[PDB]
Design a protein around this ligand. Sequence first.
Ligand code: PLP
Ligand code: PLP
Ligand code: MG
Ligand code: MG
Lengths: 318, 318
Amino acid sequence: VLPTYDDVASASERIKKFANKTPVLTSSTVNKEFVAEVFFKCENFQKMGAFKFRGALNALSQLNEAQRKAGVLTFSSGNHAQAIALSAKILGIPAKIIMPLDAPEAKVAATKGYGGQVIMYDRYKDDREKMAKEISEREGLTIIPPYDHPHVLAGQGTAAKELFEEVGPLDALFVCLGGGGLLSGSALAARHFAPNCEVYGVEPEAGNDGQQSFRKGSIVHIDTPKTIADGAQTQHLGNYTFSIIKEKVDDILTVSDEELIDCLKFYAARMKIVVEPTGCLSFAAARAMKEKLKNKRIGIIISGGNVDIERYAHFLSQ
Amino acid sequence: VLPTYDDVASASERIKKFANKTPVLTSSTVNKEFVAEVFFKCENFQKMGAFKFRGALNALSQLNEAQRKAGVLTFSSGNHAQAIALSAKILGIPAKIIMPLDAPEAKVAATKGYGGQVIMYDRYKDDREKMAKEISEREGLTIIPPYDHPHVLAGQGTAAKELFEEVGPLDALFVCLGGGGLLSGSALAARHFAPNCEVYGVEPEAGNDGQQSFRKGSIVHIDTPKTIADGAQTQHLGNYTFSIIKEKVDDILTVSDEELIDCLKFYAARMKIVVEPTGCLSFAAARAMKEKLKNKRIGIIISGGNVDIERYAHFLSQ
Ligand SMILES: *Cc1c(COP(=O)(O)O)cnc(C)c1O
Ligand SMILES: *Cc1c(COP(=O)(O)O)cnc(C)c1O
Ligand SMILES: [Mg+2]
Ligand SMILES: [Mg+2]
């Protein structure tokens, strides 16, 4: 049932033709403050702006003939929707995207630019799931989970795979945590390339269901948390993702929005890169324990840079 | 008198130990709109945030023993000041930096972080040059020109050198233009690596003294131009830089602030990178003629990303 590093390896092969082997950035400013060597895997530079492109492409690249012709459908309010839309376009698969009537104009335009057929719903009614079921069952459309899927998580893991192949062994790896696709895929990669590398997942303190699950040994559900980390407002971990996280992740950490904001500002002012709030979870945690990272080689996964410009300007002004 | 490609080559060797071999980014979105292949040399990822680090280091690496011990002094309101400060620190040379009393806090903090000794003056009186002469002559401090210097321009040219070495021949190269250090150094590199590459300098339309000089065959002086391109408000080209530009640059183009703003927004929203207004001059021009760049391989020099956060947020909200 559970994917292994071999699936991450095969995913690298499947996506090689379309995915970006994103650059790894370093900062003399960061290295100084940490008294270590930090390596940033920039998935904000990934096709469509987030790491999710990897898992979306890996999953769509394996649908059967009937599904390819019928098409796919998404209703997620996060990066998965655009990851699926772009992946579908690249693979010649029709894609319908359910979005709120008040969705950011730039996001709607981007989705249409990805060939996605936009279907809107009223945000106040929040009829998303109902609509997704009705449309998908009637039209034979396939819905790919944003994280709880073997193909999706294996694909997300290729970012870490690339990081290790480029910089070599790492003593610590920090990864953003929502549903757990990125973390589980990254853990598979880390355990293979660096058995002794400490792997950490990071959640917003207001939504530490992943942390609670890790402690309890069972998946814990919570009400949608209020936090600026819009991509980590997950209510619970996935079955596949948690099964791997529980076995291959060393610990789950949490950071405050205040910390996410300082990190977002730092990325902009010191490293000159645009990172969405949720994509700051990993570095914020690392900074929070820079004292325990002495002279180690540390990997930071920058998950994405898809933040509404107005919102970005807002946080930068905080 | 004039530096040649050989000086750019030797500069690469002098700075190799401290400068960043900045990454080259590409965009499927840009390639589509241009119907070509575009390559972005990211000097916003250079040490200190701008390409000037290269020329500063090349010049300071060649001062005599007396000058190294006495120190250097800068009074420029742009990136050159911090380029000199950081380069001086790295080379064990004292550096005094003259800044306005109302200089951006983050910039002052950065300069101090670079070991620079800050000296302030009143912005309304603008006593900068007077002070710089008085202090430098009394203390035996050396002042390095921000662009009109053989060592400075040769160093700036290594960015283009690196671009050509990484991506190979290019049909067109777009470079930002202020005093002409970047352009002249880049032209030297371009003529060597790609004899047939069209080299273009780009200025803000309000300050097209470089364009006028190129047309006239003589250096033209203008009053400080009003434009958001704070790093290209130069009143005239340098003697060394113009001498090279006149012989090795194909043409000088100009863009409006409106175009710079759209470019700054695009870099943030589509490529996820922070670029200061002046650093958008090169891409803005390229877009303005994307139709004449058919199926070519085009190089874009992103000169820097040092823009006050508040100012950056402001432009992003436009
Ligand atoms: C989806 C997403 C996450 C969370 O990833 P999961 O696999 O759900 O844990 C984090 N950051 C960004 C930018 C995302 O798009
Ligand atoms: C200094 C500077 C320029 C202009 O370079 P010159 O060598 O004066 O032509 C352009 N962009 C940035 C970001 C700069 O710092
Ligand atoms: Mg959570
Ligand atoms: Mg000018």
